[PDB]
Amino acid sequence: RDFAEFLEIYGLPMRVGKYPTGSTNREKATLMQAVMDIGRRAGGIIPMGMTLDFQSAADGQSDPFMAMIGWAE
Amino acid sequence: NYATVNDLCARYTRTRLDILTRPKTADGQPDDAVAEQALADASAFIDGYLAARFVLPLTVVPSLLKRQCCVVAWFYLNESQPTEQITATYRDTVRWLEQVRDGKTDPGVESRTAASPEGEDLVQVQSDPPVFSRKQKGF
Amino acid sequence: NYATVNDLCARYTRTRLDILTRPKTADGQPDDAVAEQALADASAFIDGYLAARFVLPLTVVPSLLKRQCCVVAWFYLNESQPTEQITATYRDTVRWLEQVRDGKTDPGVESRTAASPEGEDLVQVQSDPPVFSRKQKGF
Amino acid sequence: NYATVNDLCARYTRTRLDILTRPKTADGQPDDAVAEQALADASAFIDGYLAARFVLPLTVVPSLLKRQCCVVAWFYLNESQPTEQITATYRDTVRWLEQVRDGKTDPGVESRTAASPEGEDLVQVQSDPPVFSRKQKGF
Amino acid sequence: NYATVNDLCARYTRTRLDILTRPKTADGQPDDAVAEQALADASAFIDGYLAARFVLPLTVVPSLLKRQCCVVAWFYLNESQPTEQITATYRDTVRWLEQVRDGKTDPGVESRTAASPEGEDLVQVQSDPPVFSRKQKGF
Amino acid sequence: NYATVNDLCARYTRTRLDILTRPKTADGQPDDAVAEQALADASAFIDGYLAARFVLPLTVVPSLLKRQCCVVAWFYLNESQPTEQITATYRDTVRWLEQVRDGKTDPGVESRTAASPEGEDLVQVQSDPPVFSRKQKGF
Amino acid sequence: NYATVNDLCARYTRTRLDILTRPKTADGQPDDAVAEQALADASAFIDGYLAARFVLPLTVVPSLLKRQCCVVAWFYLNESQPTEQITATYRDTVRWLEQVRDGKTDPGVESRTAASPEGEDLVQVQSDPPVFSRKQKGF
Amino acid sequence: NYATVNDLCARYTRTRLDILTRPKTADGQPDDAVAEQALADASAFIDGYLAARFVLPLTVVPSLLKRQCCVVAWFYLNESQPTEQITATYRDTVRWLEQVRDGKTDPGVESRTAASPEGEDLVQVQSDPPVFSRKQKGF
Amino acid sequence: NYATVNDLCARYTRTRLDILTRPKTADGQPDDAVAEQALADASAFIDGYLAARFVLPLTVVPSLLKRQCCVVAWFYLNESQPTEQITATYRDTVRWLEQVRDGKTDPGVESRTAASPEGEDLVQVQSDPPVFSRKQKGF
Amino acid sequence: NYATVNDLCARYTRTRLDILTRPKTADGQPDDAVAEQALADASAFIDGYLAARFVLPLTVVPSLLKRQCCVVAWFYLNESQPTEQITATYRDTVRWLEQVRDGKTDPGVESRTAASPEGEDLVQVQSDPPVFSRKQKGF
């Protein structure tokens, strides 16, 4: 079950967006929608004040889970 | 324009504006046409920085824009000899305008009702439809 | 507005405000309309920085906002010639406002009851429902 | 408020406070209402920095808060012309308040009994129950 | 030209322009030909920076260009001895022009109707037709 | 308090303290209540820095704390006009207090007997019992 | 040359040019031959920087080149004693010329019609014919 | 204490010490009680830095400690107005004390016999007994 | 001590030393006891830096130590008012002493015969006996 | 010593040396014993830096050592009030001595015959005999 949960959140880094403190409430909504619209071969234009980065939320291999499963079996 | 001649006469005494308009007019009677031209130039200067984030003309005018326009117009009128305080205020106003253009500060909303001016999409991305997403629920 | 003309007359002598309003009015009687306009401009200036974190209009008004509004309004009125202390106080006030906007300091709560003004969600994330979580307890 | 008018009259001579209140009042008799307003503003200013770590209102009041409130209130009263020492003391007080807000120094405890004001959890983490821990002792 | 001699006489008194034109003309009557030459040189100087982003001649003229042209032309006329304020204004104008050329600020739009001057494609890429794209929908 | 009024009168002449207390009292007779209040404020200020490392109230009082309290109390009393040496001594005292709080210097021990004030555990770690250690000696 | 003696007499009074030419000539009558020599030297100086990007002689002459040539020629004439403003203008002109040579700013186009001077290929690459390209469409 | 009143009277003239003690005493006869209090405070100040490396009280007293105590005590006595040389000597003494505390310099040994004061273990490590070492000589 | 009172009287006139000892003694006759105390303090100060590298007391005394002791003792005596040259010489001496302590310069040897003072082992390492070395010559 | 009293009298007038020795002697006749003591101290100071590279006493004395000794001895004698040039020369001499000690410059050789003073091995390495070297020529 832990292996399945790890596989669920694997190989898809989280997309974050940084906005200046002077941004309007509506401007945050547009950025949030734009972050949610990333897939396949995606483009996009970002202002100089804003930044976009990808951070991986899970890393590792399947060797230990499979080793334990095989030992138990 | 974001400000009228009456608004300028509210911040500054009518005597000072009359003294300013004394040489620019041809006759002895002071003329407010130069004041209107200064107001128009000030509005254009403000719009130059405002065009970065909000579509023009503005749907709703923030209250502070009136004071900023009055300040820069008064600086424009006092071109023959500017005092220290007038130059400092104009520099502060242009610094605030640059901060607004860069997105480091919000222009604000009108006091009568909470409403921010409309603007174009600063950030936009494009991609093909997402097949095989978790919203499919077909498999 | 966060402050009234009576609040301004509390910080500053009525004689000084009358002297300030002497040239701006048309008749000999001092007028407080210019004082109200300065208060409105000060409130708009404060709201420009307050809109970053809290929704406007504010549900509860922190106590210090009154003093900040009075200070910036008095600076606005003393535009013909500002003294060193007035300019220093205005600079300190705007620095505090920028610190509030950046989130480096809290505006505070009203003294009558502990209550902070409401604001929108600064941080928000989105994700699909978490299947296979440890809260499932089905396997 | 963290300080009363009597506490202010303890630090500063009654004559000086009367001179301060002479122009702000309407009649010839000095009024302490402006002093109370200054004390309230000082308390709000202190609470603005204190809200970062401790829940308001404070369960126990540290002793130094009284002196800090008196100092900032006296600075607020002396707005027409501040001396070098008063400005220096106010700057030192606000620097100490910022240090307290950042957590670099402790506000202290009341001298009558050792007791620090209550505050919310600055650091909090969440996780699911720890199965397979060494406290199980079932295998 | 972006400005006419009447526009220059609006910003500056006719007496000052006459004094400027007194030595440059051959006869006793002041001549505006030198003023027109200064205006043409100012327009060329502005176009030198404007050619980076917008195609010339401009389809629509932003309002602030008139004031910028007047300022630089007045600086050009006052070459025998420039005052501090005139030199400072000219330096500010050229700094703004460099900022416009670098793309750090927008020139603006004319106040009569929202319209920006046309310009060539700053960014252009080339590639062969995209076979095997997701828009094919043939497989 | 770490110091008494007699200790303050030991460092400073009774005449100087009487002159200090002349305006703060209501009657002609000098009052030491303001001196006691200054001593209490000084003790609270010292405790604010001492609470970082040692539990309050202190089990044993280091000897130098008396002099530090006297110095800061004398600085507090001389608020109307501070001399250069008094301000320098107060700055040195607060720098020493910050050094003590940061742990860069030891407050010391009382001269009568070697004894340092008790304090809480600055460093603490937690772990489960160490099975399979070399102290087992069972295998 | 990019400017004529009449153009120089347009910017500067004929009296000043006559005074300049008084010592350089052999007879009492002022001579414009030295002015023509200065204009030729100025044109050569401008061409030295212009040769980097545009082929010489220029197909079309930008309007600002006339003013730049006049400025540098006037600086050349005033070699016995240069004033502060003349030296500053010459330094600004040479800085602009270096910026043009480095490609950081465009010289501009003539105002009569939009046309930029022709120039050689700044960037050129060479390669053999591209067989197996996607334009083949033979396989 | 590391120094006595006679040692202080050896460095400084009895007249100067009497003048120092004139205002601090209640009667006309100079009193050395304030001198003893200053010596005790100086000894405590020295012990504050000495406690870092050596256990207190010291088994053997280095000779220079007497002079350091006398210097800091004399600085403490001259609090009403310190001269440049006295302040410089006190600063040098405290710098030397900080250097001693940091371990960058040795306090020294008494001249009568070579003996350094005892101190606790600055560096200590712990480990289980070393089996399989080369000192075993059993295999 | 590294120097005697006669050595001090060799560097400095007996009149100057008598003037120095005039106030420190109780009677009219100058006393050299204060000079001996200063010499002892100087010797202790030198030993404080010398203890880093050489064991005390020194087996052989370098010649320069006498002059260094005389210089620092004379500086100690002139504590009421030090001249620029005396302070500079004392600073140079203490800088040389710190350089000696850090090992950046050698104290020297006595001129009568080449001999350096004995000192403890600054560098020491420990290891078990080296079996299998190339000095074995058994295999 | 590297220099004699006659060598000192060669660089400096006998009158100046007599004036220097006037106060240090007890009788009216000038004495050269203080000059010899200064020469000995100078020689010790030079040897302190020379001991780093060369074994003492020196087998051959470089010629410049005489002048260096004379310079530092003259500086030592002029301790009551040093002039700018004397202090500068002494600083240059000590800088040269430090450069010699660090090995950045050679002391030189005596002019009569090329010969450098003997010194110990600055660099030394140790290793066991090199078997299997190419000098074996046995295989």
PDB file of C-alpha atoms in Angstrom, chain D:
ATOM      1  CA  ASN D   1      -3.716  50.585  27.860  1.00  0.00           C
ATOM      2  CA  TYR D   2      -0.398  49.493  29.356  1.00  0.00           C
ATOM      3  CA  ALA D   3       0.136  52.874  31.053  1.00  0.00           C
ATOM      4  CA  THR D   4      -2.052  55.506  32.695  1.00  0.00           C
ATOM      5  CA  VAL D   5      -1.828  59.294  32.783  1.00  0.00           C
ATOM      6  CA  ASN D   6      -0.421  59.094  36.319  1.00  0.00           C
ATOM      7  CA  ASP D   7       2.395  56.865  35.049  1.00  0.00           C
ATOM      8  CA  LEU D   8       3.174  59.442  32.358  1.00  0.00           C
ATOM      9  CA  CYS D   9       3.176  62.178  35.011  1.00  0.00           C
ATOM     10  CA  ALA D  10       5.623  60.041  37.002  1.00  0.00           C
ATOM     11  CA  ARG D  11       8.227  60.008  34.219  1.00  0.00           C
ATOM     12  CA  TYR D  12       7.612  63.600  33.114  1.00  0.00           C
ATOM     13  CA  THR D  13       6.796  66.695  35.137  1.00  0.00           C
ATOM     14  CA  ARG D  14       3.144  67.728  35.287  1.00  0.00           C
ATOM     15  CA  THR D  15       4.204  71.169  34.041  1.00  0.00           C
ATOM     16  CA  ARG D  16       5.597  69.736  30.797  1.00  0.00           C
ATOM     17  CA  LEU D  17       2.442  67.704  30.148  1.00  0.00           C
ATOM     18  CA  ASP D  18       0.301  70.764  30.881  1.00  0.00           C
ATOM     19  CA  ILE D  19       2.359  72.810  28.408  1.00  0.00           C
ATOM     20  CA  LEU D  20       1.887  70.042  25.838  1.00  0.00           C
ATOM     21  CA  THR D  21      -1.880  70.003  26.400  1.00  0.00           C
ATOM     22  CA  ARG D  22      -2.226  73.812  26.363  1.00  0.00           C
ATOM     23  CA  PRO D  23      -2.776  74.253  22.584  1.00  0.00           C
ATOM     24  CA  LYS D  24      -4.633  71.001  21.891  1.00  0.00           C
ATOM     25  CA  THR D  25      -7.504  71.842  24.260  1.00  0.00           C
ATOM     26  CA  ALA D  26     -10.184  74.388  23.404  1.00  0.00           C
ATOM     27  CA  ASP D  27     -10.415  76.095  26.813  1.00  0.00           C
ATOM     28  CA  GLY D  28      -7.725  77.427  29.127  1.00  0.00           C
ATOM     29  CA  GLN D  29      -7.828  74.404  31.420  1.00  0.00           C
ATOM     30  CA  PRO D  30      -5.382  71.656  30.356  1.00  0.00           C
ATOM     31  CA  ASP D  31      -7.093  68.423  29.324  1.00  0.00           C
ATOM     32  CA  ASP D  32      -5.737  64.888  29.672  1.00  0.00           C
ATOM     33  CA  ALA D  33      -7.975  63.478  26.918  1.00  0.00           C
ATOM     34  CA  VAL D  34      -5.197  64.010  24.369  1.00  0.00           C
ATOM     35  CA  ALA D  35      -2.817  62.223  26.743  1.00  0.00           C
ATOM     36  CA  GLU D  36      -5.212  59.268  26.923  1.00  0.00           C
ATOM     37  CA  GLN D  37      -5.492  59.227  23.124  1.00  0.00           C
ATOM     38  CA  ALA D  38      -1.695  59.201  22.839  1.00  0.00           C
ATOM     39  CA  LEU D  39      -1.537  56.343  25.352  1.00  0.00           C
ATOM     40  CA  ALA D  40      -4.111  54.377  23.344  1.00  0.00           C
ATOM     41  CA  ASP D  41      -2.172  54.934  20.116  1.00  0.00           C
ATOM     42  CA  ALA D  42       1.032  53.837  21.860  1.00  0.00           C
ATOM     43  CA  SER D  43      -0.671  50.687  23.148  1.00  0.00           C
ATOM     44  CA  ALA D  44      -1.930  49.898  19.644  1.00  0.00           C
ATOM     45  CA  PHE D  45       1.568  50.432  18.232  1.00  0.00           C
ATOM     46  CA  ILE D  46       3.036  48.049  20.815  1.00  0.00           C
ATOM     47  CA  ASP D  47       0.305  45.466  20.178  1.00  0.00           C
ATOM     48  CA  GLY D  48       1.091  45.586  16.463  1.00  0.00           C
ATOM     49  CA  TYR D  49       4.515  44.092  17.166  1.00  0.00           C
ATOM     50  CA  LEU D  50       3.364  41.923  20.084  1.00  0.00           C
ATOM     51  CA  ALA D  51       0.724  40.108  18.005  1.00  0.00           C
ATOM     52  CA  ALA D  52       3.426  38.154  16.144  1.00  0.00           C
ATOM     53  CA  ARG D  53       4.253  35.799  19.029  1.00  0.00           C
ATOM     54  CA  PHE D  54       1.707  36.253  21.842  1.00  0.00           C
ATOM     55  CA  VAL D  55      -2.081  36.081  21.736  1.00  0.00           C
ATOM     56  CA  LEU D  56      -3.903  39.322  22.505  1.00  0.00           C
ATOM     57  CA  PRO D  57      -4.970  40.543  24.948  1.00  0.00           C
ATOM     58  CA  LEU D  58      -1.960  39.537  27.040  1.00  0.00           C
ATOM     59  CA  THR D  59      -2.584  37.227  29.985  1.00  0.00           C
ATOM     60  CA  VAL D  60       0.297  38.811  31.932  1.00  0.00           C
ATOM     61  CA  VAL D  61       1.857  42.192  31.142  1.00  0.00           C
ATOM     62  CA  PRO D  62       5.675  42.422  31.262  1.00  0.00           C
ATOM     63  CA  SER D  63       6.931  45.343  33.317  1.00  0.00           C
ATOM     64  CA  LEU D  64       8.996  47.000  30.567  1.00  0.00           C
ATOM     65  CA  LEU D  65       5.910  47.439  28.366  1.00  0.00           C
ATOM     66  CA  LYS D  66       4.804  50.305  30.616  1.00  0.00           C
ATOM     67  CA  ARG D  67       8.032  52.227  30.028  1.00  0.00           C
ATOM     68  CA  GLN D  68       7.990  51.494  26.293  1.00  0.00           C
ATOM     69  CA  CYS D  69       4.405  52.757  26.043  1.00  0.00           C
ATOM     70  CA  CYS D  70       5.276  55.896  28.007  1.00  0.00           C
ATOM     71  CA  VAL D  71       8.282  56.588  25.767  1.00  0.00           C
ATOM     72  CA  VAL D  72       6.409  56.187  22.491  1.00  0.00           C
ATOM     73  CA  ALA D  73       3.438  58.188  23.810  1.00  0.00           C
ATOM     74  CA  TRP D  74       5.745  61.032  24.848  1.00  0.00           C
ATOM     75  CA  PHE D  75       7.314  60.949  21.387  1.00  0.00           C
ATOM     76  CA  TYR D  76       3.827  61.094  19.858  1.00  0.00           C
ATOM     77  CA  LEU D  77       2.926  64.114  21.993  1.00  0.00           C
ATOM     78  CA  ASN D  78       6.137  65.958  21.030  1.00  0.00           C
ATOM     79  CA  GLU D  79       5.348  66.050  17.323  1.00  0.00           C
ATOM     80  CA  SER D  80       5.591  69.819  16.783  1.00  0.00           C
ATOM     81  CA  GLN D  81       9.333  69.784  17.505  1.00  0.00           C
ATOM     82  CA  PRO D  82      11.199  66.670  18.686  1.00  0.00           C
ATOM     83  CA  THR D  83      14.557  66.915  20.400  1.00  0.00           C
ATOM     84  CA  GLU D  84      17.533  64.704  19.590  1.00  0.00           C
ATOM     85  CA  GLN D  85      17.265  62.591  22.747  1.00  0.00           C
ATOM     86  CA  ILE D  86      13.517  61.994  22.361  1.00  0.00           C
ATOM     87  CA  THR D  87      13.927  60.855  18.754  1.00  0.00           C
ATOM     88  CA  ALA D  88      16.868  58.636  19.721  1.00  0.00           C
ATOM     89  CA  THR D  89      14.868  57.028  22.535  1.00  0.00           C
ATOM     90  CA  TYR D  90      11.899  56.439  20.224  1.00  0.00           C
ATOM     91  CA  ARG D  91      14.176  54.862  17.608  1.00  0.00           C
ATOM     92  CA  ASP D  92      15.731  52.610  20.251  1.00  0.00           C
ATOM     93  CA  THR D  93      12.263  51.599  21.455  1.00  0.00           C
ATOM     94  CA  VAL D  94      11.045  50.721  17.961  1.00  0.00           C
ATOM     95  CA  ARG D  95      14.268  48.798  17.287  1.00  0.00           C
ATOM     96  CA  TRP D  96      13.683  46.809  20.480  1.00  0.00           C
ATOM     97  CA  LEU D  97      10.088  46.172  19.401  1.00  0.00           C
ATOM     98  CA  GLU D  98      11.235  44.884  16.001  1.00  0.00           C
ATOM     99  CA  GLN D  99      13.777  42.652  17.743  1.00  0.00           C
ATOM    100  CA  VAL D 100      10.983  41.272  19.940  1.00  0.00           C
ATOM    101  CA  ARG D 101       8.778  40.677  16.893  1.00  0.00           C
ATOM    102  CA  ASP D 102      11.566  38.832  15.063  1.00  0.00           C
ATOM    103  CA  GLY D 103      12.120  36.636  18.127  1.00  0.00           C
ATOM    104  CA  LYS D 104      15.693  37.820  18.712  1.00  0.00           C
ATOM    105  CA  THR D 105      14.915  38.930  22.283  1.00  0.00           C
ATOM    106  CA  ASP D 106      12.404  38.009  24.977  1.00  0.00           C
ATOM    107  CA  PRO D 107       9.958  40.674  26.230  1.00  0.00           C
ATOM    108  CA  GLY D 108      10.472  39.418  29.786  1.00  0.00           C
ATOM    109  CA  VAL D 109       8.197  38.552  32.685  1.00  0.00           C
ATOM    110  CA  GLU D 110       6.444  40.610  35.331  1.00  0.00           C
ATOM    111  CA  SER D 111       8.557  41.200  38.427  1.00  0.00           C
ATOM    112  CA  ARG D 112       5.824  40.246  40.910  1.00  0.00           C
ATOM    113  CA  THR D 113       5.813  36.610  39.762  1.00  0.00           C
ATOM    114  CA  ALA D 114       7.633  34.685  37.042  1.00  0.00           C
ATOM    115  CA  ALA D 115       5.046  34.382  34.264  1.00  0.00           C
ATOM    116  CA  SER D 116       5.344  34.829  30.507  1.00  0.00           C
ATOM    117  CA  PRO D 117       2.375  35.806  28.317  1.00  0.00           C
ATOM    118  CA  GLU D 118       0.621  32.992  26.489  1.00  0.00           C
ATOM    119  CA  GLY D 119       1.054  32.627  22.745  1.00  0.00           C
ATOM    120  CA  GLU D 120      -0.029  30.486  19.831  1.00  0.00           C
ATOM    121  CA  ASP D 121       2.039  27.634  18.405  1.00  0.00           C
ATOM    122  CA  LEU D 122       4.702  29.180  16.178  1.00  0.00           C
ATOM    123  CA  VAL D 123       5.796  25.760  14.866  1.00  0.00           C
ATOM    124  CA  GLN D 124       3.354  22.965  14.067  1.00  0.00           C
ATOM    125  CA  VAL D 125       3.664  19.770  12.022  1.00  0.00           C
ATOM    126  CA  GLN D 126       1.151  17.100  11.062  1.00  0.00           C
ATOM    127  CA  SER D 127       1.514  13.409  10.277  1.00  0.00           C
ATOM    128  CA  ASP D 128      -0.473  10.187  10.360  1.00  0.00           C
ATOM    129  CA  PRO D 129      -0.186   7.831  13.366  1.00  0.00           C
ATOM    130  CA  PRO D 130       3.223   6.079  13.522  1.00  0.00           C
ATOM    131  CA  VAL D 131       2.661   2.355  13.079  1.00  0.00           C
ATOM    132  CA  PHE D 132       5.725   0.070  13.206  1.00  0.00           C
ATOM    133  CA  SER D 133       7.396   2.354  15.751  1.00  0.00           C
ATOM    134  CA  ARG D 134       9.686   1.048  18.475  1.00  0.00           C
ATOM    135  CA  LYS D 135       6.970   1.822  21.044  1.00  0.00           C
ATOM    136  CA  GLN D 136       4.778  -0.926  19.557  1.00  0.00           C
ATOM    137  CA  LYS D 137       6.503  -3.802  21.412  1.00  0.00           C
ATOM    138  CA  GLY D 138       4.089  -6.230  19.778  1.00  0.00           C
ATOM    139  CA  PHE D 139       6.543  -8.118  17.580  1.00  0.00           C
TER     140      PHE D 139
END
